[PDB]
Amino acid sequence: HMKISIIGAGSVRFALQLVGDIAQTEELSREDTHIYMMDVHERRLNASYILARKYVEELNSPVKIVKTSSLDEAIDGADFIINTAYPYDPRYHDSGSQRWDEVTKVGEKHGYYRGIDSQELNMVSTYTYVLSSYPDMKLALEIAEKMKKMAPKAYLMQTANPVFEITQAVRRWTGANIVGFCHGVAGVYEVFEKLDLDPEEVDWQVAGVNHGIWLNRFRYRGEDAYPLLDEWIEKKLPEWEPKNPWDTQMSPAAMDMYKFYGMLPIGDTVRNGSWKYHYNLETKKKWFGKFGGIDNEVERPKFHEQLRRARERLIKLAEEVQQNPGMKLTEEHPEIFPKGKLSGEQHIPFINAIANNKRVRLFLNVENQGTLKDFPDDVVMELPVWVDCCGIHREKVEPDLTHRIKIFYLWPRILRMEWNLEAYISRDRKVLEEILIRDPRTKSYEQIVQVLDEIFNLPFNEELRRYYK
Amino acid sequence: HMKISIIGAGSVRFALQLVGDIAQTEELSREDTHIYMMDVHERRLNASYILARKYVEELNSPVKIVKTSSLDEAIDGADFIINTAYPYDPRYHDSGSQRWDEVTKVGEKHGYYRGIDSQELNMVSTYTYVLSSYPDMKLALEIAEKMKKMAPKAYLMQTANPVFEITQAVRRWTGANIVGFCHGVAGVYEVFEKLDLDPEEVDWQVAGVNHGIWLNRFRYRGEDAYPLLDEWIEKKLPEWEPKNPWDTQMSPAAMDMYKFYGMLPIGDTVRNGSWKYHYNLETKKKWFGKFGGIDNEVERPKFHEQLRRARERLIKLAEEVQQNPGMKLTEEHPEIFPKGKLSGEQHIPFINAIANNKRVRLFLNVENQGTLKDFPDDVVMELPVWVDCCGIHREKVEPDLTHRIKIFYLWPRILRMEWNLEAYISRDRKVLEEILIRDPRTKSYEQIVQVLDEIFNLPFNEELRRYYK
Numbered sequence: 038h039m040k041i042s043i044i045g046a047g048s049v050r051f052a053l054q055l056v057g058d059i060a061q062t063e064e065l066s067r068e069d070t071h072i073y074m075m076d077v078h079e080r081r082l083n084a085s086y087i088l089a090r091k092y093v094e095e096l097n098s099p100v101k102i103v104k105t106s107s108l109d110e111a112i113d114g115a116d117f118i119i120n121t122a123y124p125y126d127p128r129y130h131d132s133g134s135q136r137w138d139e140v141t142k143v144g145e146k147h148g149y150y151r152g153i154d155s156q157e158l159n160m161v162s163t164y165t166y167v168l169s170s171y172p173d174m175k176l177a178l179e180i181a182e183k184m185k186k187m188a189p190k191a192y193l194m195q196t197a198n199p200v201f202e203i204t205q206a207v208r209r210w211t212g213a214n215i216v217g218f219c220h221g222v223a224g225v226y227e228v229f230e231k232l233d234l235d236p237e238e239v240d241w242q243v244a245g246v247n248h249g250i251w252l253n254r255f256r257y258r259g260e261d262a263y264p265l266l267d268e269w270i271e272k273k274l275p276e277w278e279p280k281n282p283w284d285t286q287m288s289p290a291a292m293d294m295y296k297f298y299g300m301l302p303i304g305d306t307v308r309n310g311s312w313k314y315h316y317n318l319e320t321k322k323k324w325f326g327k328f329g330g331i332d333n334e335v336e337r338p339k340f341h342e343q344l345r346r347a348r349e350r351l352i353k354l355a356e357e358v359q360q361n362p363g364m365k366l367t368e369e370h371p372e373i374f375p376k377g378k379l380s381g382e383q384h385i386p387f388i389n390a391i392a393n394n395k396r397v398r399l400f401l402n403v404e405n406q407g408t409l410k411d412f413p414d415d416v417v418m419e420l421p422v423w424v425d426c427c428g429i430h431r432e433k434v435e436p437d438l439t440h441r442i443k444i445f446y447l448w449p450r451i452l453r454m455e456w457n458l459e460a461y462i463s464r465d466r467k468v469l470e471e472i473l474i475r476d477p478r479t480k481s482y483e484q485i486v487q488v489l490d491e492i493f494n495l496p497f498n499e500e501l502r503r504y505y506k
Numbered sequence: 507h508m509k510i511s512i513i514g515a516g517s518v519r520f521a522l523q524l525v526g527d528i529a530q531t532e533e534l535s536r537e538d539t540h541i542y543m544m545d546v547h548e549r550r551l552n553a554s555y556i557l558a559r560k561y562v563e564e565l566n567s568p569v570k571i572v573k574t575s576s577l578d579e580a581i582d583g584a585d586f587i588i589n590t591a592y593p594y595d596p597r598y599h600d601s602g603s604q605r606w607d608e609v610t611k612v613g614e615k616h617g618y619y620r621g622i623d624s625q626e627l628n629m630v631s632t633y634t635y636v637l638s639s640y641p642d643m644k645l646a647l648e649i650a651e652k653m654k655k656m657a658p659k660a661y662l663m664q665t666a667n668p669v670f671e672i673t674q675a676v677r678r679w680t681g682a683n684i685v686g687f688c689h690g691v692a693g694v695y696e697v698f699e700k701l702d703l704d705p706e707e708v709d710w711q712v713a714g715v716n717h718g719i720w721l722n723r724f725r726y727r728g729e730d731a732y733p734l735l736d737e738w739i740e741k742k743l744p745e746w747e748p749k750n751p752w753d754t755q756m757s758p759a760a761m762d763m764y765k766f767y768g769m770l771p772i773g774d775t776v777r778n779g780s781w782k783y784h785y786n787l788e789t790k791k792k793w794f795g796k797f798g799g800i801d802n803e804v805e806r807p808k809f810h811e812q813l814r815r816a817r818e819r820l821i822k823l824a825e826e827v828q829q830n831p832g833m834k835l836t837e838e839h840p841e842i843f844p845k846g847k848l849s850g851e852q853h854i855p856f857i858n859a860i861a862n863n864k865r866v867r868l869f870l871n872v873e874n875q876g877t878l879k880d881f882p883d884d885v886v887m888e889l890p891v892w893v894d895c896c897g898i899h900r901e902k903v904e905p906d907l908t909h910r911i912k913i914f915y916l917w918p919r920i921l922r923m924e925w926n927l928e929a930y931i932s933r934d935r936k937v938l939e940e941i942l943i944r945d946p947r948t949k950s951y952e953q954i955v956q957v958l959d960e961i962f963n964l965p966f967n968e969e970l971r972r973y974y975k
């Protein structure tokens with residue numbers, strides 16, 4: 038049978054996205070497809086299971102769904118292991134977002150706007166946790182080592198952040214068969230929409246590192262199409278306004294990076310600029326418009342509170358479904374339980390490409406292996422690839438990324454990854470200190486010590502404290 | 507004949523060092539050895555010539571000395587071209603030190619302690635000028651292009667700073683036969699002296715980039731000798747005191763870098779730490795002892811004033827020598843005009859190794875060419891080499907530099923070199939802005955613009971202004 042395991046299946050909406058895509062993929066929607074849903078939170082796990090079962094039943098799909106609280110049971114003999122888990126200390130918290138919000142506030146207390154985990158070229162909220170992302174890294178490495186023993190054919194499809202750091206560390210330190218997943222590339226379709234271009238007529242390519250990807254090829258009707266972006270900047274950018282806090286692809290920040298680097302940053306890359314765009318909320322609003330993006334002291338707490346209410350509502354929905362088994366979720370909440378339209382994410386196409394040779398182009402975090410020849414072979418990049426039964430085949434990246442992207446953006450971001458991995462494996466607080474010694478917001482060494490101390494002393498960081506002690 | 511040209515021969519003491527070494531090297535002290543002394547400053551050039559002639563006459567050396575104000579005449583058919591020139595705008599200044607002192611003060615006015623040219627891993631005073639070192643780079647590239655035409659066999663021996671940036675740019679953009687020169691490696695002999703070790707019994711090696719070199723091998727009697735440094739740190743470091751502002755090799759800063767990186771930084775590398783050691787004068791004194799090193803607002807102006815008085819005194823000596831041709835300089839000022847003892851610098855051994863096959867081990871700035879395999883082949887490194895008539899032969903660097911030196915020190919310093927070269931060749935002020943956007947002392951973008959503006963507007967920066975305009 039085909040065993041697909043979701044680790045952190047209490048991530049309700051994502052679990053439902055995965056299930057619905059599987060149930061709507063002919064080659065996978067079979068009685069021999071077993072979806073294992075695993076999580077450490079009983080209530081969230083049960084809600085995802087109840088909704089996933091009902092959803093499948095309404096889609097007339099014969100896939101079997103299994104819930105389990107045993108990580109080993111989920112890993113054993115799996116063919117694909119999707120890691121979307123976000124660890125937390127259950128004595129203090131109910132989910133992982135809380136530890137990042139609280140550490141961030143301590144960082145701000147000590148003079149680090151948006152927390153010590155916000156750094157140049159890595160502003161994406163919750164991407165790293167206390168620089169080295171100990172609990173997230175630790176879980177990924179634990180899964181990889183169990184996978185090599187109990188499931189040596191499986192793919193570990195890492196979606197929990199930091200995707201770059203984790204995919205790199207697992208590859209390098211375990212050799213387990215990990216691939217990192219992020220669909221930030223989808224930003225390109227808004228570029229095409231704003232320039233009035235049929236995406237099917239655009240010859241495009243993107244490449245870089247996770248949340249550090251660039252539109253390296255953008256061609257239309259046998260010519261460079263970037264001059265069309267030049268026109269849009271001249272004639273449309275003054276009137277641009279974001280539709281919501283996440284809407285940054287065509288923002289002044291993205292175009293300012295385009296003007297300097299020569300290629301347009303794509304997706305979350307636009308959030309990950311230098312400090313020029315992020316010194317404070319006023320600066321963020323100048324460069325991202327009225328919300329100041331999503332990575333600020335107003336919008337991010339607002340969003341994390343929305344997620345909490347959504348978590349509770351879906352759980353309530355699960356209870357409601359038990360009491361009223363006659364209701365059709367596809368009808369009452371079609372947005373959450375759609376039929377006839379795949380989500381568009383890459384996870385289930387990846388599985389269907391590996392297992393059923395349904396060949397597709399995806400953007401995946403895999404070892405460079407010479408694709409960007411100026412970088413080491415073993416560094417994990419986010420690359421355009423074709424996936425089939427024979428594995429993952431990297432496209433040629435042409436044009437190459439510009440010289441400025443290499444020396445000003447990709448290499449600094451790659452070194453930060455190496456810093457963060459060194460901080461994890463050395464168990465050495467001096468390495469965390471050195472990272473903050475390279476941080477523009479540091480004013481003194483005593484400040485670094487004090488901010489780390491207070492973070493380490495937070496009750497829910499007992500394990501972290503002992504690890505670095 | 508053998509033609510050795512000194513560009514910037516108004517650098518009196520260095521010129522005299524070169525002349526005296528040539529006059530005391532049997533294979534070079536010949537009638538067929540023509541030393542050309544070239545400089546744009548008539549008074550300084552004439553003083554170096556008069557003293558160089560008298561010095562040789564007192565050394566009973568038959569070398570011919572020629573002074574000229576024509577760069578082309580000095581370059582034409584030369585076999586070796588030593589560039590020690592420090593450009594300046596003669597409408598405002600008398601020497602190059604003045605432009606760096608004044609720009610530095612403007613940087614401090616705008617909140618950049620020790621000027622915008624002081625940066626992490628590059629604190630050495632006067633190493634770069636307004637980041638891209640325009641007048642210094644411009645002169646080196648002008649010499650290289652004249653050399654390829656008028657002297658295609660010559661070695662361009664670059665001693666004027668920035669040695670790293672300039673050697674890299676000349677190699678990459680002209681392919682001229684440049685080699686960069688710095689004797690910072692000499693720090694090792696003080697390490698051996700403080701640990702009571704005969705240098706002849708120490709098996710040692712150093713490697714890195716210019717002013718970024720590390721004692722990668724330190725062995726004594728068939729064992730690692732670093733444990734002897736551990737003992738010294740435990741028992742002698744508390745009593746350490748610098749003999750003068752330049753004395754940093756065994757300082758708390760060097761040992762703190764040793765503890766983190768696993769290898770001891772050598773020479774000027776100790777000046778080139780992170781901002782941990784340099785936030786302010788008090789911090790510098792904690793980490794370098796009572797003077798706070800040489801790269802601070804007290805000691806550096808003091809030193810540049812000493813150099814000025816030395817310049818005038820030597821010039822006066824030249825006049826005195828004319829009026830009193832009976833005096834023996836070797837007798838009256840043996841420290842400046844020694845006999846029977848070579849200086850110990852690398853320039854004349856280099857020449858004698860190339861021209862006369864007198865084979866020697868030196869530390870020179872040359873292309874990596876695989877010596878440090880984790881770095882690009884074309885990046886200029888400061889490497890241990892053997893020089894003979896057949897060229898420059900890199901030793902194998904064993905042990906390799908540590909992982910932390912690579913990701914925390916060498917790679918950041920190499921990227922800064924690439925930033926500085928991009929800032930020069932692009933003629934693009936936005937690249938200078940980006941460098942300051944990566945600077946910890948920057949608080950706002952408006953601050954960057956204002957500090958560059960005021961620097962660009964200084965009268966003696968007219969050429970710089972127009973270049974970036």
Ligand SMILES: NC(=O)C1=CN([C@@H]2O[C@H](COP(=O)(O)OP(=O)(O)OC[C@H]3O[C@@H](n4cnc5c(N)ncnc54)[C@H](O)[C@@H]3O)[C@@H](O)[C@H]2O)C=CC1
Pocket residue numbers: 044045046047048049051075076077078081108120121122123124125132133134163176196197198218219220382
């Ligand atoms: N690329 C994509 O489509 C998506 C990416 N993600 C990423 O995954 C990470 C988590 O995000 P959310 O799902 O919204 O957070 P979440 O907190 O809502 O989900 C985490 C789930 O993992 C559970 N968990 C914690 N520790 C676990 C452990 N040892 N074993 C098994 N389960 C454990 C938690 O109980 C929770 O149910 C984020 O970094 C996010 O960016 C998650 C959703 C979709």
Ligand SMILES: NC(=O)C1=CN([C@@H]2O[C@H](COP(=O)(O)OP(=O)(O)OC[C@H]3O[C@@H](n4cnc5c(N)ncnc54)[C@H](O)[C@@H]3O)[C@@H](O)[C@H]2O)C=CC1
Pocket residue numbers: 513514515516517518520544545546547550577589590591592593594601602603632645665666667687688689851
């Ligand atoms: N490795 C070594 O042994 C030494 C290295 N240097 C380095 O060279 C640079 C200059 O240092 P100093 O000699 O003390 O400064 P300096 O100002 O005393 O000497 C510079 C000389 O070059 C002349 N000059 C300026 N523009 C010129 C041009 N276009 N053509 C020919 N000559 C020109 C100047 O008139 C002056 O006489 C520094 O970066 C220094 O580190 C210099 C002395 C020895």
